[PDB]
Amino acid sequence: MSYLLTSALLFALGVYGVLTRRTAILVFLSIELMLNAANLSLVGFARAYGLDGQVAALMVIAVAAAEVAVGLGLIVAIFRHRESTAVDDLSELRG
Amino acid sequence: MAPIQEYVGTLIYVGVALFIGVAALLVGALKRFPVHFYVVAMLFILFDVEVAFLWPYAVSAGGLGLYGFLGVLAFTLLLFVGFLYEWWKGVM
Amino acid sequence: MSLLEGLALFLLLLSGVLVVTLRNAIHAALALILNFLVLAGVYVALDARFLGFIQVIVYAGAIVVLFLFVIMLLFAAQGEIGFDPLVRSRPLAALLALGVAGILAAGLWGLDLAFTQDLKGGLPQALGPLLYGDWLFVLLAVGFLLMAATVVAVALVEPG
Amino acid sequence: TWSYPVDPYWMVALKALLVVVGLLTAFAFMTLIERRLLARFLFVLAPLISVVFALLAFGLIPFGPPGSFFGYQPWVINLDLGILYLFAVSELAVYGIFLSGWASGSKYSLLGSLRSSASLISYELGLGLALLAPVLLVGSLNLNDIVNWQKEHGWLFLYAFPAFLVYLIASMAEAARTYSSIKWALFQMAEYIHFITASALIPTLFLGGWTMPVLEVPYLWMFLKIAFFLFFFIWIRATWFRLRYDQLLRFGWGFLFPLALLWFLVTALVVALDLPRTYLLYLSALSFLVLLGAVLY
Amino acid sequence: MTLAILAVFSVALTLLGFVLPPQGVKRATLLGLALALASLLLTWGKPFAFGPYAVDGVSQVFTLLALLGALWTVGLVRSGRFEFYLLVLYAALGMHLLASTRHLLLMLVALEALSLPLYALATWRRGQGLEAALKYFLLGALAAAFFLYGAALFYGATGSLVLGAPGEGPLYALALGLLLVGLGFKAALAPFHFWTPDVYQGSPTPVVLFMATSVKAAAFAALLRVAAPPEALALLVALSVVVGNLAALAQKEAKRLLAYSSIAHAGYMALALYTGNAQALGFYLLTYVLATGLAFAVLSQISPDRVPLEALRGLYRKDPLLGLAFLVAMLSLLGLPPLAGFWGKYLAFAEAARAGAWGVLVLALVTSAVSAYYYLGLGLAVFARPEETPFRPGPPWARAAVVAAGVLLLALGLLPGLVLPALAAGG
Numbered sequence A: 001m002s003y004l005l006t007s008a009l010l011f012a013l014g015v016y017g018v019l020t021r022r023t024a025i026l027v028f029l030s031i032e033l034m035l036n037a038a039n040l041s042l043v044g045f046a047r048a049y050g051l052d053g054q055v056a057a058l059m060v061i062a063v064a065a066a067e068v069a070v071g072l073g074l075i076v077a078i079f080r081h082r083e084s085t086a087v088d089d090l091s092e093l094r095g
Numbered sequence B: 001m002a003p004i005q006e007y008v009g010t011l012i013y014v015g016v017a018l019f020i021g022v023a024a025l026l027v028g029a030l031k032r033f034p035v036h037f038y039v040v041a042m043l044f045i046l047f048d049v050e051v052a053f054l055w056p057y058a059v060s061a062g063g064l065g066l067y068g069f070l071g072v073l074a075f076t077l078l079l080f081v082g083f084l085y086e087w088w089k090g091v092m
Numbered sequence C: 001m002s003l004l005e006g007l008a009l010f011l012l013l014l015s016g017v018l019v020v021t022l023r024n025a026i027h028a029a030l031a032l033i034l035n036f037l038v039l040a041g042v043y044v045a046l047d048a049r050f051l052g053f054i055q056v057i058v059y060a061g062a063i064v065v066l067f068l069f070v071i072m073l074l075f076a077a078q079g080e081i082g083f084d085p086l087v088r089s090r091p092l093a094a095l096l097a098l099g100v101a102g103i104l105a106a107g108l109w110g111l112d113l114a115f116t117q118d119l120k121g122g123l124p125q126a127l128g129p130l131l132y133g134d135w136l137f138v139l140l141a142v143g144f145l146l147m148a149a150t151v152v153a154v155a156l157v158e159p160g
Numbered sequence D: 001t002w003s004y005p006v007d008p009y010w011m012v013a014l015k016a017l018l019v020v021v022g023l024l025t026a027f028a029f030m031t032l033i034e035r036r037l038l039a040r041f042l043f044v045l046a047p048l049i050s051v052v053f054a055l056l057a058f059g060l061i062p063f064g065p066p067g068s069f070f071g072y073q074p075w076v077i078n079l080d081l082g083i084l085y086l087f088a089v090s091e092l093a094v095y096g097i098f099l100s101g102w103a104s105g106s107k108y109s110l111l112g113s114l115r116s117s118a119s120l121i122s123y124e125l126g127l128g129l130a131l132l133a134p135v136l137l138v139g140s141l142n143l144n145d146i147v148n149w150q151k152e153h154g155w156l157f158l159y160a161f162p163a164f165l166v167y168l169i170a171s172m173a174e175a176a177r178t179y180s181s182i183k184w185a186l187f188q189m190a191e192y193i194h195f196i197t198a199s200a201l202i203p204t205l206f207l208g209g210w211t212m213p214v215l216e217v218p219y220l221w222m223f224l225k226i227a228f229f230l231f232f233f234i235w236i237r238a239t240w241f242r243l244r245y246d247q248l249l250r251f252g253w254g255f256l257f258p259l260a261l262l263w264f265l266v267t268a269l270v271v272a273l274d275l276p277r278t279y280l281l282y283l284s285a286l287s288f289l290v291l292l293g294a295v296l297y
Numbered sequence E: 001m002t003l004a005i006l007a008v009f010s011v012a013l014t015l016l017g018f019v020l021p022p023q024g025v026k027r028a029t030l031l032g033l034a035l036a037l038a039s040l041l042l043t044w045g046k047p048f049a050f051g052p053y054a055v056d057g058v059s060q061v062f063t064l065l066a067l068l069g070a071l072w073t074v075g076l077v078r079s080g081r082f083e084f085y086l087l088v089l090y091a092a093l094g095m096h097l098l099a100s101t102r103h104l105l106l107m108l109v110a111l112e113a114l115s116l117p118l119y120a121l122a123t124w125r126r127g128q129g130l131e132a133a134l135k136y137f138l139l140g141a142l143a144a145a146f147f148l149y150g151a152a153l154f155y156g157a158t159g160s161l162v163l164g165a166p167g168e169g170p171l172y173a174l175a176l177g178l179l180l181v182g183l184g185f186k187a188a189l190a191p192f193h194f195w196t197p198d199v200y201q202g203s204p205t206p207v208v209l210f211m212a213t214s215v216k217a218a219a220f221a222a223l224l225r226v227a228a229p230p231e232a233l234a235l236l237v238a239l240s241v242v243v244g245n246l247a248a249l250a251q252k253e254a255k256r257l258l259a260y261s262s263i264a265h266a267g268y269m270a271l272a273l274y275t276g277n278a279q280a281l282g283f284y285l286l287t288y289v290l291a292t293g294l295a296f297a298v299l300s301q302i303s304p305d306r307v308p309l310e311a312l313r314g315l316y317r318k319d320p321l322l323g324l325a326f327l328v329a330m331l332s333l334l335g336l337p338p339l340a341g342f343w344g345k346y347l348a349f350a351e352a353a354r355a356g357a358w359g360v361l362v363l364a365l366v367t368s369a370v371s372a373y374y375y376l377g378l379g380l381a382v383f384a385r386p387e388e389t390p391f392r393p394g395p396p397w398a399r400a401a402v403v404a405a406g407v408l409l410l411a412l413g414l415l416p417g418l419v420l421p422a423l424a425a426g427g
């Protein structure tokens, strides 16, 4: 229980990260922290409901990895020759 | 399985090791750039995952029988289709 | 319990605060590895042991290593310089973060749960039969996801 | 770690200290041997890490049956999840490597550090795919269970010979080659420490580390096996060695790592179908016959 | 099994494409998609439940439509990089999985399965395409995070990660909201819709076709599985409808206007969720995938990178049947009788009113009447005097495609008593 609240606080912290971070990689990082908050909550509740939540959290980790591969791949691809990685440098597409 | 004491012991061990590290330090007081090194880093972060799944099988394996083995086989073959791809694609 | 727990969770929240605060990408990521270490600690303390070791090995060991290789292979900590600040946003980001915190705290209040399960320290000996068993479909699907993921990532780079 | 006793924390800490200083003096001796044979925040922090996590995880390695460290325990820490701990501590020294690379601020300081970092990671990872196969047989991740399994059923390299080959070959190829005055000293120290650690690990896993059929003396046996593989390591060090890493990665993956996990599935099929354990004695014998007899051409 | 066909073809084609010419791989992916689809048609009314995997009416219809989107999108993309078909197969299977389970975590895996290769498909390597991929990816990953935390809170408030679990008080609600965030984002419902215009305008056009049809389809299939509460449902609806049409007014570019149109349309579709009828939603999405698919095929035959509305004008003279089919599409997307789109809209509205959501319903109807501004501004624009406009007058493939799929529309406008009898359990 004491942990669950820390999980929520962490997720919030990650949200703050995403909203605050100026560069792509670091926004992505803040997202990773959020994911981890979720994982911790999954562990606590697994400890309440019996272990399926651990397998869950592990699958979650795997998934996270996959999207890290693709996401960093994208970040590198788009910004390789291009200059500074600040994500607001791409504002061409306007509503 | 293991008594919880030995994780604490692990941590203590870490403490000693770190302190000694600090000690030795104080005796010190006495284009294409990403591609390769990215691809072969990403594949690390994938094989770590693979193995992270293979370990739970390797322990409870004979208990899981031919269907368990079949599962681990399928899994392995999928991921190796991936690796075989980025191998046949080439990495340099 | 609370003796270690206080220090552990404080260190957790502190670490997260750092990873979202530090202006050095290397330093940030690094702080996140500290986070993952402590997190694997907490997992161990939460009878999820194998998950903890995978937490060090995959998440701390491997993933943020890829992050580091990437921020080092472009440029880290010198990317944030630009000064298109939007500092009217910082208290709004902070406020919205506090809101997304408050809502979760609210939803978690009044929860009386039996956190007493026999979940015999997250060992892979007990994890396995579930994984290659009731979880085998999700496992295999995940495998496929990894394959497709690598094909994407490679095709997402592919110079020439 | 049920059936295996627990020492008071003071003793664990003291034993740990002893092990660290012993590893250090061992390293000192080693360097002296090879030399008589040849006759800002991160800059500081990085080698600290590489030394810390190198020193870590020599402790799991059991030096004798319980009670035999004068009433106590030959090991430092025992751990149910034995083999994952090793992996975990091994990643982080490498962390230290590439980090120190970034620290310098020079091209190729970084780049090179990334080359060695990546390669060490590669082969270190290869060791895991190697170790799956014999874990299948033991059915435990704990090193004491592994060792004692070699006491009863006998020396794992007899059952997992291919895995033994890739383990030995890889862990040995690690030894091969590719202000700043102290930095290199600290790093090399960490590296050698890792080397003697491997020189202990190879016997502990695939052979019967300590735990001989005959004489059954606790320490001296492990010390001798260690001295053997360590000798081979120093021989690798003194002559220098070149692999240059384009061919080392290719060889590593393209041969060793597929082979390691292909063998894993073979022993997996065997354990799942329960057949005997004999089929792996036979297989390892045969694979040895090929992978030796085709060398002697 | 459809899943079997998809898996087989994907894994096989991955390595086979090294030994096959890109074109041959296109033939492959086409055949595979077609076979999956055929396997679906042959088991209509089978319900096949395996593990967390479950093929019922919903999975059947929605993966039928999704596979149709995959089929059409593959048709148009001769450009040789075998992955630019492979990834479509990957995505396709993923969307199937997404539509085929109540298991939250497998659902997440399916979401990544379909949305990861799409981040890649947003790359015609155009500078704007890269922007699209980046936005889609970041916002996507954040949404993912929310959906995951929602799953963890669902497993919080109940012992399961399966939807259909009884459900508590507050924590259960918070869980459903946190799920609706990610799922809603994936279906372009407000206020989770921001990515849609930039991504549709930025991505290569056939890819956008694939998205606006298949993705939305699977997304809604997965939304049927959620117990979506009346309040949240109302919010999502009202916002999506209003923002959809009203913002759609200001659009001077075709693709982006169609994105906003898709936001409003998601808004209308959500009404079916009020009862969660799924017979209504199925029909609606049949008409929608048909007409939208058509519209985007036509918009493909003009320009892949981007299309200004002026380009649409004079289309009739150039090709009479593409002009007519495009007009028909615009009218069916308007929801004007006697076209199938009107029946879909009616069938969703029907569930809204049946549920007793009157204010929401009316609002939707008012702004739907507003939407007649821009749907006509295209369909009519078909007959205007041609500005100098790019036009590659298509193969028999695409012409017969747009024409047939178009005819289907008013065919079901006159006779919805053809397909509607069984978009249900299959009887």
Ligand SMILES: CCCCCCCCCCCO[C@@H]1O[C@H](CO)[C@@H](O[C@H]2O[C@H](CO)[C@@H](O)[C@H](O)[C@H]2O)[C@H](O)[C@H]1O
Pocket: B078, C133, C134, C135, C136, C137, C138, C140, C141, C144, E007, E008, E011, E049, E050, E051, E052
């Ligand atoms: C390469 C492409 C990859 C795509 C994914 C393909 C995956 C297919 C593999 C299916 C094996 O996965 C596994 O199947 C069986 C039966 O279906 C499941 O078993 C479960 O379902 C059955 C049937 O309702 C129940 O009797 C049983 O109590 C339950 O445990 C198990 O939970 C699942 O985890």
